[PDB]
């Protein structure tokens, strides 16, 4: 009957929500990789700050002639 | 059967709500995924910046 | 009916998935405020780069 | 019945999307760490600005 048509509609919308959940999960995964790169950026800027300090060190030597 | 029909309709309503949740969630993830290109561009500027410090570290010795 | 209790559990489980999705949506909305942060960062960096170069120019004149 | 087994199929598929949600929850939790990575970078760029101003101050003095 119309009950069987309905029961197959529930099954199919459940299968479609499952399939979109896999795509949402991939996009989350790809953002998590981007978190790894943002972590490396954090690390590179700290290394740059260490370097600016060397500059400043030599610049102090120049100022005292 | 009137009760089962009405309950089955509840399940279908509930699925349509979850389908709409999925679509709102997919939309916010696609807006976030724009960060990818911004982070690639930041990687390039950091490298450009590293180079520039070395040009500086050096000049500060030909002077010194 | 075992069938009635089954349909009730099915209803309860869906409403819980839907209630949990609301929390997922607000948290994701809260991450979109990062686009403004990361952009402010891109601008900061370009400005620092410019400055370092502006420093080399001054060094040449010394 | 044909029906009982179909309703079992629905329960199985429902368990799956509950499963999906747990995995979306755990990933999202991990992603939320990004806000703190971005805030840390902002602090680091502030400190860099300061350290550059110092350097220009010194080139100014010379």
Swiss-Prot record, chains C, D:
Changes after translation:
Phosphorylation on serines by host CK2 is necessary for the formation of viral factories.
**Residues engaged in binding Ca(2+):** 6
Q: Where is this region: Multimerization?
A: 1-62
Subunit organization: Homotetramer. Interacts (via multimerization domain and XD domain) with polymerase L; this interaction forms the polymerase L-P complex. Interacts (via N-terminus) with N0 (via Ncore); this interaction allows P to chaperon N0 to avoid N polymerization and non-specific RNA binding before encapsidation. Interacts (via C-terminus) with N-RNA template (via Ntail); this interaction maintains the P/L complex anchored to the nucleocapsid template during the sequential transcription. Interacts (via C-terminus) with protein C this interaction allows C to associate with the ribonucleocapsid.
Q: What does this protein do?
A: Essential cofactor of the RNA polymerase L that plays a central role in the transcription and replication by forming the polymerase complex with RNA polymerase L and recruiting L to the genomic N-RNA template for RNA synthesis. Also plays a central role in the encapsidation of nascent RNA chains by forming the encapsidation complex with the nucleocapsid protein N (N-P complex). Acts as a chaperone for newly synthesized free N protein, so-called N0, allowing encapsidation of nascent RNA chains during replication.
Supply the domain comment: The N-terminus consists of a long intrinsically disordered tail. The central part contains the coiled-coil multimerization domain (MD). Forms a four-stranded coiled coil structure. The C-terminus constitutes the alpha-helical domain (XD) that binds to the nucleocapsid (N-RNA complex).
Family membership, please give it. Answer: Belongs to the morbillivirus P protein family.
Task: Name it.
Answer: Phosphoprotein
Q: Which organism is this protein's natural source?
A: Measles virus (strain Edmonston B) (MeV)
Q: Please name the taxonomic classification of the source.
A: Viruses, Riboviria, Orthornavirae, Negarnaviricota, Haploviricotina
